[PDB]
Paper text:
Gp45 of ϕ11 was identified and characterized as the receptor-binding protein (RBP) of ϕ11 9. Furthermore, it was shown that ϕ11 was unable to bind to the cell wall in the absence of WTA–GlcNAc, identifying glycosylated WTA as the receptor. Although phages are the most abundant and diversified biological entity on earth, each phage can only infect a limited number of bacterial strains. The RBP structure reveals a trimer with a complex fold that can be divided, from N- to C-terminus, into a “stem”, a “platform” and a “tower”.
The RBP of ϕ11 assembles into an elongated homotrimer, with overall dimensions of approximately 160 × 120 × 100 Å. We therefore suggest that it serves a different role, perhaps by helping to stabilize the bundles that undergo a sharp turn at the hinge. Helix α3 (residues 88–97), a short triple helical coil located in the hinge, has an independent rotation axis not aligned to the remainders of the molecule. Contacts between the three propeller domains are sparse, as each interface between two propeller domains buries a surface area of only 457 Å2 from solvent, and much of this surface is buried due to a helix-helix contact at the center of the trimer axis.
Numbering used by the authors:
A (entry chain A): -1 to 307, 309 to 376, 383 to 636
B (entry chain C): 3 to 378, 383 to 636
C (entry chain B): 2 to 636
Write the structure that this text describes.
């Protein structure tokens, strides 16, 4: 009927006879295709009649290139002309040939041929020169990459929720997520993931991972892998690898050793180059070597495909001093097209930060350049990265900076890129806004949320009545949830505290306002809602389910109690029920206690107000205060 | 990439996944080797050198190149052997420009011509290659593989799915449609950052699936499908205006005798001056053709002249207008009809297809998944072909209405030529509360009648003189002696906003008021809420006020001096001109106010007077007096 | 040799995984071997083929390469060539071109060959020139006569006045703008490339500041300005930027005074050609009826440095470009062209951009500039003032014509830069600094400019900030005394007005205590004008303790900030009602009064007993006495 030579690429999800039968079928098809390729090559070489046309065959002799068919046609034509061609009047035919195409009569055939060839040779060389010059100009405009000369351009800020200097950063060319490291006090390092505008996404604490100076980030068949330098239970060095996940990770079965036998004799860290599929290693020489080699750090270039199994150092180079302390310690490392980029060094403050370039094969210093920024008109180094654009193949040298003293630590990425790379990186994600791009309220991330504290991105939001019903952390009990609210999520501090402001969407009722601090990393640390009184001249009613005034404990939130409603309250002053309207005031006290005031809404009669304190201190009695009517 | 040779020793997800991966890689490698061998056989120019080709005749083996050299050399020697004594001028001509002496004139001419022919072909090859590289870098346009890039959000004040959008290349205004109940559609105009400008309700317009937008001698025209009074299909044109429009004298019929036999809508291509029509088959026609829609390509000039001539026509197969894959977007560019389909839910992906309009063939079908960073499910919503006025560069715009159910947020994504997306993203920066330099934004009106007319979010400042005319100010005119900071904040998706007024005071308290406004109807505007804040300053009652009953703002205290107390006609009769007092204004029912006058006594006994007044009547003052203690 | 296993194990065993591993490795090796074999066949194999496998077909001949070679060799032998005369056979043979075509004559063959190559090379040359012309038009097109101006940024000085001029520093990206002031002064404000205010200089008796020449000399920026002396005489000078105030005298250097001080003289500096372009006025004695008011001189900046008087090119500006309805607003120069921007704000007539060829004096173009669009809501009819500038990019040498605008009216006055640039210039200028944000780009709190600041009023840029406990300790303008400084605070700096009043909001970072909130207005140009902090009460139900170091209730003066006093604590207050110490818990309320005075209420935290509250007023009015109010216990 038909027979498809196409392989089964969608397999059975269960190990069956069918799963085996699909694999055998594929291997049978592949075996036949391979046997056919082997037969085809042999047949091409030995039997195929018209393996090629003669036009596909080069014929070259003494600086002349033609093809076999055209040269055969040429030879046959030379024969045919000698047989068929008329014998001319020699001299007169030669005399006629002295006249060039413009009609100019040269003195000799050789003069004419010389003039013709020279005219075309000079012309074609002039066209070739213009081609090379236009191409050189085009390539310089588009692909110029000079880290020794170009001024770094600001790309973005990086906003982790950790107050520490940045060790390293890596921009994922596929997802555009930024992976950054920050050392933590207990020989741990924090690995934060950010959006390309620097906005925090999530994080991973690498427990006993050391300082996190740098990691190698490698994609393997659409899956991302992180190659990290760590420490075990005994604080001994280990070069391991693992896939990202949020939360925590420690040396054990959760991560894979690479080649422990050759790397764990020293501190071993690495960076991955996707262009050449190389894995560049930065290994610390043992303390005893620092006195003899005068080189505190060394770099070894190895292959990634070869790192998946075999041991082979392609090129090795010692990092001289002063490129590793005291006034110039290592702050950044990257690699591109046979050049090792090295960023030094501390600074705070006096001494400038330097970017160096070394030829990894010759070990020579190619350039040393001062790196300084003046756009926030001191500044300290924080990592290097080599960005390779997935769509265009274009590149940029990324320079990470951490600016300010201690508390005021802010991080930024600067770049030296090829044409359009910096503009692309700066504009992947617009900077964080309180609204959408058009100035409208941002959408909520959850429908009828269990926790309002789950809204962790700053912004102006709106919560409808039905979306407040499930809230477990709402400022008002469920009996009061009859309205829509404006929600403002504002920045807090550098470690995860944010502010949240709720305002009731009321035109004919007062705009109730509450504010709190939330800890986005632990809701148990969330602050209580602060009621901020504001009033438009409207009354506030008590929900009908409430029969005790003692249930009303929000400080500064008044209620109106009509004459009829006053009968419903079991804790209402006994001899003051069903006679007048009252304003209930709820005032401050100690934790577990409340102060309440009921003030009469009297018109011709004497003013009366009743005060009580109640809670853990006991159920206090009401005390009456009465005034004297005057004119 | 590389074949996985170390497989999982446990039959699980990774085993099946990497087993499938290997077979996909093997399939590609087999196809590549077959292509290489076929290309070697049929197309490679210089598949071989002649020295690799055996020439064997009488048990003597040579190669093709050396035998060709031998034959050519024989020929020339034969010519020299039958040339008499030659011609010296011809002998001289055997020497080429380098000084190399060839055997015959023919050998010299051959060599010269070949040298120049090979050289000029080498220059031509470099020209074509440099130009191909340049054109690929600058003008690559591949909707089948390029990843859509976020351009902007669209922010209408209509909470409905977007039907269509069009980016005006001259003004940069975005024209978007949203279907409304009652068979109307709303046409909203937005800034290129999505900010709402104004809108037009197209009464009995239908769903507003798409309009054709065309400039005719500097005048913008909108070609729409609309309904008449009898609910009959009318293909029309009209120019934009705000408010409302309906079928009649305000709309011009466009070839009614040709299009009004069915539902007809259009899109306009400015490059080829084509109007592309999407038309419906009637229920009876649908089963026979297995198609709901058909597309007609016509000249816009022919439309202007009223001449009926279908240049190219194509039926859309039902699978592209189905329950699972309904039409969500349509556009056209350089002989290709782009068709966007998708469902709102069910984990079925949305698709972008491209059809060759001339041959009717499907060129590509691709899943459109905005699995990016600006997204962190998708509801497909329109296509547009943006054509840059300055450069002629283009982009395929993809509209998305995202969000789980309600409320809807809209965004434009793009597949563009070099620099187009960067340009579109940055025409207008995203909305800010300040100007670009962090300063207060300018007010849209000087001495405004209504503060509610300030409808764009932002931080503003109103000078004393610009508060004088306000008809909706939180304080009466007697109190308008200061500048105020005005903050206009987002409210909800439908048009409610918040407004906050704060008095610019250094030596007086910073009075603060807040309200909700309805930007579409000021009658729905909320009352101003006073938010008390105090720096320790007193607040004076304007001299023009002689009744304490005029002071009704809750929480706003006033100080009354001994002399001032005499002026108030409603001051407790026996308490005038004897002391200073603090007037407190407290909460009550609507139409009523509570007031407290507390004495500013120093050595004498404290006194305070309370009253309630308004619709409940003019309540009497009640005195409360304390006992001096140590 | 090894073959693929096609009969696999029927159980997911170790044998199954191995057989699959073996096959994949064997497939990979076979494909590598096939690819090596094909590459070797193409490039190195000697006798890759026999000539019989290679097709030779031409017209009525169908053959293979080997048989055709045999045929040609055979033709050699049986060919009978005549002894046709001296050079006869050689000339005849030369008539055959490289394709094997036999021309009738040597001249015909040479004509054909030359013409073929001449036509071909001219075709290649035409494509080269066309590709280059297209490339240059795409990259370097600069047409102020037709290109549409693009919005770059707003400019945000702290001065309410029309902008006279602006200059974008290509090295620092700082924008230098001038605004005329009453009293014949001009304000020179420096801004970030997003328009954010940095600092300013008041050029006392500087005149209008119509335009300055900005020039770098050995890494030093110099400003060449028209200024006036004490006698209101015109002085052409230079000075380096400083903040504050400057006036004619020792701080300003005269620039060829004997040449330029006979009239009003202002300049612009072109860095490409190192030219100083002068705009000068004709004096009334030099003018007849409708004569021109202004003239422009082109001079070398080297000649200016050396004090050499040499006008390279001069041109009078026709009166129609310096009129009541078309007065001068902007001036710039580029590549032999003088750009002139005219406009009258209140007459509703249009604004124009003109280009003049400075050498020939001819008008090249006149176009209406209407920048009313999506970026200005679309306030085109309100274009109030304008300036021009030529931006020259340091990195690329690319350029842009910058068009400055002020859109009015009066108080609603706002400034913007629009541009007509070469490819990528506008995108570059728009994105040097992102527009001002309340947060960093990732939505986090912005860093503070000072550690443990003396004044919070020194934080003058809008934004959300955080101050740690230790950084509040030495604040001289904090809303609470030092005894209360035990917490971190959120600080919000908000815009105020156009002249420099900003708002500051402080909120206590409290989860288990109330979030104390204070707000004030600051004058960023004079802290003596700073307002007092307003306390905004908000309460989560927590009590507030009086620091143990405080023993006077009279020290607690913040209005609306309540404190709780325990029975034990009530004994330490020297101003507590004498007969009410150590008997109960109390809530202290602090209420409004006149400046210099405070009202305090002590309300008892009684449970079964009668409620009591005590009121007092104290301060400049005297130390008022406490008054007791007692209630009656009811059921
Ligand atoms: Fe071959």
């Amino acid at each position: 009927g038909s027979m498809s030579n196409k392989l089964i690429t969608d397999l059975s999800r269960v190990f069956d006879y069918r799963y085996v039968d699909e694999n055998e079928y594929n291997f049978k098809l592949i075996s036949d295709m391979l046997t056919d390729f082997n037969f085809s090559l042999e047949y091409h070489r030995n039997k195929e009649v018209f393996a090629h046309d003669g036009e596909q065959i080069k014929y070259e002799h003494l600086n002349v290139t033609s093809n076999v068919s055209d040269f055969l046609t040429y030879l046959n034509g030379r024969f045919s002309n000698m047989v068929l061609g008329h014998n001319g009047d020699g001299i007169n035919e030669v005399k006629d040939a002295r006249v060039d195409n413009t009609g100019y009569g040269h003195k000799t055939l050789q003069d004419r041929l010389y003039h013709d060839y020279s005219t075309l040779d000079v012309f074609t060389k002039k066209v070739e020169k213009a081609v090379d010059e236009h191409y050189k100009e085009y390539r310089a405009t588009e692909y110029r990459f000079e880290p020794k000369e170009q001024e770094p351009e600001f790309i973005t800020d990086l906003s982790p929720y950790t107050n520490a200097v940045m060790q390293s950063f890596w921009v994922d060319p596929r997802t555009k997520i930024i992976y950054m490291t920050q050392a933590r006090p207990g020989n741990h390092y924090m690995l934060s993931r950010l959006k390309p505008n620097g906005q925090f996404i999530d994080r991973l604490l690498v427990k006993n991972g050391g300082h996190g100076t740098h990691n190698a980030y490698r994609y393997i068949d659409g899956e991302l892998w992180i190659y990290s330098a760590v420490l075990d239970s005994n604080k001994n060095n280990k070069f391991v690898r693992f896939q990202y996940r949020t939360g925590e990770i420690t040396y054990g079965n959760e991560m894979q050793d690479v080649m422990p036998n050759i790397f764990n004799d020293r501190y071993t860290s690495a960076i991955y180059n996707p262009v050449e599929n190389l894995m560049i290693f930065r290994r610390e020489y043992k303390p005893t070597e620092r006195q003899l080699k005068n080189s505190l750090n060394f770099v070894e270039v190895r292959s990634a495909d070869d790192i998946d199994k075999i041991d082979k150092v392609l090129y090795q180079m010692d990092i001289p001093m002063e490129y590793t302390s005291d006034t110039q310690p290592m702050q950044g490392i990257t690699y591109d097209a046979g050049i090792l980029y090295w960023y030094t060094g501390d600074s705070n403050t006096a001494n400038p930060n330097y970017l160096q370039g070394f030829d990894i094969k010759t070990k020579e210093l190619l350039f040393k350049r001062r790196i300084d920024i003046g756009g926030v008109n001191f500044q300290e180094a924080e990592g290097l990265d080599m960005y390779y654009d997935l769509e265009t193949g274009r590149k940029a040298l990324l320079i990470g900076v951490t600016i300010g003293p201690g508390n005021n630590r802010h991080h930024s990425i600067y770049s030296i890129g090829q044409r359009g790379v910096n503009q692309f990186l700066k504009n992947i994600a617009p900077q964080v806004s309180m609204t959408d791009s058009g100035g409208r309220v941002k959408p909520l991330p959850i429908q009828n949320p269990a926790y309002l504290s789950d809204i962790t991105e700053v912004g102006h939001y709106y919560i409808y009545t039905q979306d407040t019903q499930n809230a477990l952390d709402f400022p008002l009990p469920k009996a009061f949830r009859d309205a829509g609210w404006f929600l403002d999520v504002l920045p807090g501090h550098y470690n995860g505290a944010l502010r949240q402001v709720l305002t009731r969407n009321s035109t004919g009722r007062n705009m109730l306002k509450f504010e709190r601090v939330i800890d986005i990393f632990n809701k148990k640390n969330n602050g209580a809602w602060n009621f901020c009184p504001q009033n438009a001249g409207y009354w506030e009613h008590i929900p009908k389910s409430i029969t005790k005034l003692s249930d009303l404990k929000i400080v500064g939130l008044d209620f109106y109690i009509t004459t009829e409603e006053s009968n419903r309250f079991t804790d209402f002053p006994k001899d003051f029920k069903g006679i007048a309207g009252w304003i209930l005031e709820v005032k401050s006290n100690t934790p577990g206690n409340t102060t309440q005031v009921l003030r009469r809404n009297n018109f011709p009669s004497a003013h009366q107000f009743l005060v009580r304190n109640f809670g853990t201190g006991g159920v206090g009695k009401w005390s009456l205060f009465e005034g004297k009517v005057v004119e």
